[model samples]
Target: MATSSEEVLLIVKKVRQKKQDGALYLMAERIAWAPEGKDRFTISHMYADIKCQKISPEGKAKIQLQLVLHAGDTTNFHFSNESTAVKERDAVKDLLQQLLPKFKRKANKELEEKNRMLQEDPVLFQLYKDLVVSQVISAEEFWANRLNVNATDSSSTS
Candidate 1:
């Protein structure tokens, strides 16, 4: 089922709590830009990172959130070029604001499609799950065995 805005808000709050607890959270956003100058309206990629740390010895924690926006790959349009520059900028900003809901809908649709595909292909899904489980086991054994081998080699070489 598609998550509602209320659910998403709750998730965001939970993530913020995790960030405040010295956890790292990463998220990406797709931005839509309006056509300006010779450029056309398009969606751009952006990301945000949340980091938390103890700022004081008395258990005071601080959270830092950074958002990086990628401007569309087009020449910068100066607002002073035309008489209605301020109006133009405001219009574009307003248009961009509408993009948030559109992007959210697109994300929800993509997730639904992926889930439907997985449900339709049971054999493929089972194979994928098994591979993931096996990979986790292999990774754990590799780390544990490599540490012992490294220790033994160091002791013998000395």
Candidate 2:
């Protein structure tokens, strides 16, 4: 029997495939995050939509796309109408396909670094590590925290 984690991974793979195929829309709800060293937790939801096209009399065509990530009251990111092109759509899909593995690797590296820090700084790290182990600090939480930190730094620089 496939474990729950395996099942969730299968679903994620399906979502990626559907998005790449220009299948119009795809959503994965309550996806479990099982990052190494973090307690497993489910994402509230994730969805992507490829909208219908509109052509103008001037011969310009447009396609709208949106990606939404919502968890509880927090709307983490909303990527929408970033571009319009048939070739660009395929390019975006291909880019996503290429980047997913890189994304996974980066997540894994962060988890490992966090684990190492926990070992080095027992007092502060234990608090965070315990929460993770207990499932209170989930994989989503880990990534979100990191994202927030990066965003803060980026905004500060700008």
Candidate 3:
């Protein structure tokens, strides 16, 4: 459930919640809230901050998606209960159930080990960033000095 799928999965326009009208854009990475008059999100929540959801029990006339946030803020989004046949309503419900638990597992990584690795191999991270950012490099030019100052020079620790 560790997904980078940022594609616009579901979008509701004039998403009416109380007297306020706005937009609710659902993506794999996060949920965005934007005012009806604007396109950009005024606020958002990553999966990491999400605790769980309490969906309106099945067979209700109108459906809603509510957020249980770690910061204790109440948020709800109203949707068509049936979505013509419980189609759209369930899509988000099931996916969030699958994704929310993965956030906890991802949060449990060892910080001390991560810090130690960074302290020893800070240069390697910079190289990785350069490669990721589409910066060009000469293979021969990098290799000439690559073997000497390589951050992963240690062969005994493993």
Candidate 4:
């Protein structure tokens, strides 16, 4: 089930993934798909996690859209509604173009802040290597706790 505030931005009917047919849904924060006869979404991706989207070249037999994630994987959706495939896919594309940048800026800022800290202290860099490279903690978890420490430090300075 989607979160309580998940708002549907668009839906494209008769979309296909490989051989399984489903409907494509774009929401305020995520994109999702569900097979026919099922109300539960099997695939959902947050906009911030997506790297970019690509569409099939013009004149192709099938009209398709591919959502590329920052993790280097992709989810491809084929618009199979013969009469309205192009329009539907384009509508999804245009809306995504508008939505994706809203997330990218925030994501990049967090990375930049992390990068700044790693550069500021060589000892912090070694600790990152000791924890992250030694497999004691994942890089994401290290950063999550590191940011909290910084948050407390800054507040105490006030």
- Highest lDDT: give the candidate number: 4
Give the Cα lDDT of each candidate.
0.29, 0.33, 0.58, 0.76
lDDT of 3 at 17: 57
lDDT-best of 2 and 3: 3
Which is the leading candidate under TM-score?
4
Error of 4 at 119 (Å): 30
Residue lDDT tens for model 1, 1-158:
95422211100111121112111111223322333331333323322111111111221232222222222111122233233334433443343334433443223433343344335545434533555456744433333333333333332221
| TM-score between candidate 4 and the true structure | 0.64
Shift of residue 12 alpha carbon in model 1, Å: 35
Q: For candidate 3, list the clashing residue pairs, or say none.
A: 82-86
RMSD per candidate (Å) reads 17.9, 15.4, 13.1, 10.0
Candidate 3 accuracy as TM-score: 0.51
Query: lDDT of model 4 at residue 38?
Result: 76
Query: What is candidate 3's lDDT per residue for 1-158, written digit by digit as tens?
Result: 76566766566555555545577776676667677887777657776667677777777776677876664444676764344324554666666666667664343223333334445676654554465345565533343354344457541111
Clashes counted in candidate 2 amount to 0
TM-score, per-candidate, Cα-based: 0.22, 0.21, 0.51, 0.64
User: lDDT of candidate 3?
Assistant: 0.58
CA deviation > 4 Å runs, candidate 2: 1-61, 70-84, 105-158
> Compared to the true structure, candidate 2 yields what TM-score?
0.21
Question: How does residue 146 of candidate 2 score in lDDT?
Answer: 45
| Model 2 lDDT-worst window of ten | 70-79
